[PDB]
Paper text:
Cys-loop receptors are allosterically regulated pentameric ligand-gated ion channels (pLGICs). In this work, we studied orphan receptor Alpo4 from an extreme thermophile worm Alvinella pompejana. Each Alpo4 subunit is composed of a β-sandwich extracellular domain (ECD) and a transmembrane domain (TMD) made of four trans-membrane α-helices M1-M4. In conclusion, Alpo4 has a pore structure consistent with a cation-selective channel, but with an unusually tight constriction at the 16’M position, the role of which remains unclear.
Given that Alpo4 shares a structural resemblance to the α4β2 nAChR and the 5-HT3R, we investigated whether acetylcholine or serotonin binds into the ligand-binding site. To this end, structures of Alpo4 purified in the absence of CHAPS and with an added, 1 mM acetylcholine or 1 mM serotonin were solved to a resolution of 3.9 Å and 6.2 Å, respectively. No density in the ligand-binding site was observed in the reconstructions. The cryo-EM reconstructions of Alpo4 obtained in the presence of acetylcholine and serotonin suggest that neither of the neurotransmitters binds Alpo4. This agrees with our electrophysiological experiments in various expression systems (Xenopus oocytes, HEK cells, lipid vesicles) indicating no agonist response to acetylcholine or serotonin (data not shown). The unmasked reconstruction (red) reaches 4.3 Å while the tight dynamic masked reconstruction (blue) reaches 3.9 Å.
Author numbering:
A (entry chain A), B (entry chain E), C (entry chain D), D (entry chain C), E (entry chain B): 12 to 307, 414 to 443
Write the structure that this text describes.
Amino acid sequence: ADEKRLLKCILHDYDTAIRPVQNVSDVVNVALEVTVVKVIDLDEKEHVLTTNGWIYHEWNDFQLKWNPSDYSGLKKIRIPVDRIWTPDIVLFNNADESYRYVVDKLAVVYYTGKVMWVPHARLRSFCVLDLSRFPFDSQMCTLVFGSWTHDVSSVNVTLRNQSKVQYMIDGKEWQVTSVQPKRYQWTYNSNENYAGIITGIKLKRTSIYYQYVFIMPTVLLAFLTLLMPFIPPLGKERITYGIGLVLGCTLLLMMLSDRMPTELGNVPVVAAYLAYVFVMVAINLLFAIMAINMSMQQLTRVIDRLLFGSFLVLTVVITISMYAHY
Amino acid sequence: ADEKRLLKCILHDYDTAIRPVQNVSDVVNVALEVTVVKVIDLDEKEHVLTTNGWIYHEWNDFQLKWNPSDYSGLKKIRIPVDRIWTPDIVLFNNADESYRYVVDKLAVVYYTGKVMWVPHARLRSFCVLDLSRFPFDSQMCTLVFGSWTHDVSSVNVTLRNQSKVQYMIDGKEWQVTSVQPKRYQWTYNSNENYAGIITGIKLKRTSIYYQYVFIMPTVLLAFLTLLMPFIPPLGKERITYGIGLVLGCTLLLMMLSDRMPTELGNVPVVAAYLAYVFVMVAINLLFAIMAINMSMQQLTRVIDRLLFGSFLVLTVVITISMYAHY
Amino acid sequence: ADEKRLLKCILHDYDTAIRPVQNVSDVVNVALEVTVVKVIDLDEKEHVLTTNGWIYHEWNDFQLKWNPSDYSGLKKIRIPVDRIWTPDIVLFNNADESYRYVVDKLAVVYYTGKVMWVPHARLRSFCVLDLSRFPFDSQMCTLVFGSWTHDVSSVNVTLRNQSKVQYMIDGKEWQVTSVQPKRYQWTYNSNENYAGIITGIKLKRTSIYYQYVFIMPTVLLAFLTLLMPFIPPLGKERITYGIGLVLGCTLLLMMLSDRMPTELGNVPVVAAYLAYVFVMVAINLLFAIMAINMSMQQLTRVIDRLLFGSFLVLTVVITISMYAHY
Amino acid sequence: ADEKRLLKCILHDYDTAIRPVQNVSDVVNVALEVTVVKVIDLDEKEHVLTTNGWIYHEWNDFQLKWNPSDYSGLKKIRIPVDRIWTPDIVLFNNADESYRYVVDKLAVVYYTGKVMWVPHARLRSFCVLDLSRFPFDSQMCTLVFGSWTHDVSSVNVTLRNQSKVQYMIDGKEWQVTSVQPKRYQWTYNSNENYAGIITGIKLKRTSIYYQYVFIMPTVLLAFLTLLMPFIPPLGKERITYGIGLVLGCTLLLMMLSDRMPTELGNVPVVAAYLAYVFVMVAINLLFAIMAINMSMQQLTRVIDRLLFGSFLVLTVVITISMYAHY
Amino acid sequence: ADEKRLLKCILHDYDTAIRPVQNVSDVVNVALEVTVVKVIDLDEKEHVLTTNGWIYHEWNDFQLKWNPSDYSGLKKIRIPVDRIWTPDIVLFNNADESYRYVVDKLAVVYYTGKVMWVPHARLRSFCVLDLSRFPFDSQMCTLVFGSWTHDVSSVNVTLRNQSKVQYMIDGKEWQVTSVQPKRYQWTYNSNENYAGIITGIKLKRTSIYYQYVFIMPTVLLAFLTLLMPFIPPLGKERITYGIGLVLGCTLLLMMLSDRMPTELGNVPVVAAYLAYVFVMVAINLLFAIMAINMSMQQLTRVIDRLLFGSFLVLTVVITISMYAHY
Ligand SMILES: *[C@@H]1O[C@H](CO)[C@@H](O)[C@H](O)[C@H]1NC(C)=O
Ligand SMILES: *[C@@H]1O[C@H](CO)[C@@H](O)[C@H](O)[C@H]1NC(C)=O
Ligand SMILES: *[C@@H]1O[C@H](CO)[C@@H](O)[C@H](O)[C@H]1NC(C)=O
Ligand SMILES: *[C@@H]1O[C@H](CO)[C@@H](O)[C@H](O)[C@H]1NC(C)=O
Ligand SMILES: *[C@@H]1O[C@H](CO)[C@@H](O)[C@H](O)[C@H]1NC(C)=O
């Protein structure tokens, strides 16, 4: 055969651990590129971002050299990674118990030693979610690619010469804004220095799920508490309303506690609003109890009207403070 | 033996990476067929469709050639895939961390080099679910099969010559409509072009689960709110009803939020209806509070009757807008 | 040694892929037996039945032959399956991503070529659950064993000669009735025919869990709705009862929706009973609202009594329709 | 080297399948000991007991013999199990898909052939939980260790000579009582007999979790129903109380159904008590409805007092029946 | 090549099991260091602490010796662990079924035999959580590193010479306080002694999640019960309030039972407070029932006022007992 003849004369003394270089002091310019093709999910229960992405590798090789003219062309050979040298580049923040590479069993090589291994991975990364703007947030996620084993004396992890990765993966759940990747030198200690590549994926929330399960029932309960103090205390239904509002706000807290995770850096604004409808039922229940105790002059109507006006201006300033997000 | 004699003279210099071809510029017509035998599940929490399917492969081989007449027949040999060449065809949208394969340890070969490897897989695919018609949807799922490693210069991923796959797997949960598969040339870049095969599985919802857990309690709460404004405000039970309707609609929202996932492209119509019963309770609670404040002329009966008529025509036009799905 | 001397002269040219036969047209009678020793679980969320079972294999061999008399007895040798031929028999309906096998690393061989490999597996099978009789069902489960790779021209998957597997594994959760296994010839196409073995495990429900979490609260709410219309409408508690019945039936629907899975072929009878207590609260709430509107002649007592009698006969005929299951 | 010289002359013809023995009719006394160091969890959803334990093995060897005096001592050599013979001892009731053995890559050998392989495993075992005493139960768990492959003609699975394993692992969740292990001969059939070792771990419940989430709210609802019939029926709050008791007992059933698993052999006593507070709320709601129908002579006070006394003596005899557990 | 020439003359007779030493009685000083870089999660459902950490290893070697001057420098060689000796150091409390290792496929070696293998792991450890201070706890976690296979006669697991690991990983969920690691000699038996290293990670709770889902609704329900007894019993709403308080406290118990795990050593103080609001509703419901029975002299106002004062002083002393934590 033709490919078998060249393959029998290119891995004669090739190990999967020898760094391909001519001079020991010389390094290898292992280029890298990250291309997220589809963001799978973002769960804040354990700060996990699952994406599907291509991890483009490109390093020069010294031993994979052949002349094409005596081998009848054959400028591209498909070589598995189990019989070729492989860099130890990994996610710095991995959530899986092990690092997995879908379709990582093949890698092309060129006639100039231009291995272009492109595996595809379900990357599970860790990002800091600023949930003070929840749900209408713009918290970017950073993915780190580097080698923990060898350092800048062995490899030089750089960005791709052509960095045309300024895409926008408009999904049905998030708006994805790609950031042009940067290179930073992470230092293990003072004497030794390493390399690393940061890529950024900004996520913009656009779904109307959280405006349906949280915002609309909370603003409707706020509207109900705003309409609460018009009922006279002698009707024997104001306290029943108030305790029904307590039960409804407790069910809203049950939904929020089952949905919003344990990771809090700042209190969410929907959680702050739920605290508000609560601190209202408590305040208007106190005023209703005091009104029905005073009823047993009819001064309570003016007190309820001024209380309604104060709650009106407080609720409208809280809702226009909330509306600055959207 | 007879099979051992032929097997000892067919893998003398066979590697698991050499592409079987005679001329380098020539390609191999790697045929493909997808046959879903049983759709396991469809979960919209992370856009996962789990199916059980056969992935029929058929490629011509150049090195697996023998004359049968001097080997006493033996037109079919069972050869494991670990000692034979294997294409790198995969799902383009895989949800598992690694590609699973059930019964992939054997593959038949013919005397003309007609390897017919048929593995079986639990394919976990990603589809775009148009949930605006939820639950009575007809959102098709697309499964993509292609090679990321080699391109049209090496293999040619084509359809089966006999494409008799127009079945209909009538299950107890979905109606499965198979679509005749098509071939599209996905391009990694401008200079290089690759191959891919799209197969389609249309899912028709036929279960009465979502008509029992969502539609019937929501239409019963709508019927209850329709019957609400007949109660006189002096009976001290209209506000109690209204707040009980608030609690019941909150429990319905709790069931919907625990069931309907975070992925929303459009608001579901059952979710829109749950918004309607909510906006009713709020509106009829406002009118009940204003009626019991006016009661403390008896004009409220005509107001409640016209309100009941307006709610009657609005509820019936909303239900006949809903009934166009079913 | 004695075993090492025979082992060094029995795997001289043995591969893990050569089918052991003398003539090519001859087949091998690969016998099979299934013995479920303990049914682990049955979850209807994805039609999964987890059992622990022995998969008895017995095939004649042509190459594993030795005379015992010159080897000092030694009629039984323990040989691992990694160095011996192995059939590709599998579950036709597997739920795991890969086929698991517990204690599959050893297999006895006899002096006549009588390999008796008995692995043990946690089989995850798929069955059609007729949930119209839920919870008091008798839906059998079918487990299929066959080879997808080779056909009746190579192996002949037959029953055990001694089929004494008519046991009864009486567990604390189910009653297990073993069915005598049958053999059917599944056909991949018209020209080629394959083999398969069906074994049956009938499951009888005997637990009092579903009679405690579903049947007793639903029949108690039905009893409460039966006792509902005796309250006079002027007591201002009939509508409160009715809405409390709505809340209780909604909590019952919440428990049922969180427990009963998405797979419905037919509506469960407990679900039908729940849709009935709901259709009652709705009907008696309508009659209570009309009675309190008519009260604002005292004809409502006779109407409530005839309504109570009609609901009495309807509830008793529904409960004696339900009682035919148990 | 010294260890390399002995290691190069001890595995010259050693396979991982030859049973180490001199005479074929002779057997090997493979001793065994189980030492649970920490019980991880016990979940009754699928009868799983997760423990961390040492599985001490000790078998005599015939081929691992050397004289120490010409090898400069070296009485202990660390040998991995991949290059030494290994018994096929396993859990008879395993919940994992495949057998795990954390720290199983090394095993010491002595100069007399005294291999002392001690792996450590997260054993997932199956026990029969007698939940009639739930939560204050004393249901022991049995762990079975035996070989399915070879029988008493090959190995003899016996106890340790020194059985000092009478410890007591006092944890924060359970009290662990070790049982001295026994040996039983499990029979695959009539002609052939095998060996097995039973070890027992008795679990005593001591946590106050289930006395907080179940016992205290149920006894408080029973106290509330005991205090229920003192309210006069003309106050229009007795029926509201009763339906609030129905809602509270329904929430208690929701907590119990979400916590107590589907496996029931007998009804739990806490489940029987929730059942009492229910049938109790039903009976006093019937008597309250009949009292408010009779009110529309004032004989109902004596009826309510005798009903309260009967409920008092019934509740106190039920609570002293419950108190015999604790 | 240069690296290939040295690599072909350094693993000539190297096995992955020979302990590298010159004299048999001599030991190897296998140093160790633990560096937690990011604490992933702490779940008390099964006492699991998931951290991401570096496990620094450093042992002297006897066989990995070369002179650099005739090899043109090359003081550092990257060698995979599959072809080099590896200590069996592990977590003593592991929650995973098998020991996972991220980037463990490479390890540097120096010219003096100074292997510096640094793998990175998602360590799942077990700690005793003193939940009597929940949520404002300071329960440290202990991670144990040692070898179960060989003992102090073979290796000597010691600290790093430079122990500069006094960092503080200030996260958004916990405050991490590193403890300087210590060495303890765990004994398998009396005759033999082993080695082990304890490292400590103290976790300080700083999130406001549990102050939002538990503390604020419980203190608001306590405030509501404090405001409860002012309502006159003739208003027919005191019993309705009390039963609404019962329903709200039951929903709070539902949230607590779904969140707080089964592992209890001591009752949490938030759980004790939830007991207090419950025992109040029960006590004030008893007093409300007795007041409405006495109403059917007006001495109940003074009784309610003294009851309110006693509940005021009891609630304020309970809240200032709670406030000592924060
Ligand atoms: C790695 O590449 C960067 C790119 O500018 C260069 O500045 C740096 O000197 C390189 N490192 C080495 C060791 O050559
Ligand atoms: C692959 O097959 C299609 C089928 O028509 C053909 O048009 C195309 O030219 C083929 N590609 C190559 C490279 O031969
Ligand atoms: C397989 O066994 C059945 C048992 O009766 C027999 O009828 C059939 O002919 C056999 N098949 C072959 C190919 O021998
Ligand atoms: C195995 O050991 C027991 C211990 O008493 C002994 O009774 C039995 O005979 C032994 N079995 C064989 C086959 O030697
Ligand atoms: C291990 O190191 C400690 C450090 O002080 C030392 O005391 C001890 O003797 C050493 N053990 C051996 C066996 O050398």
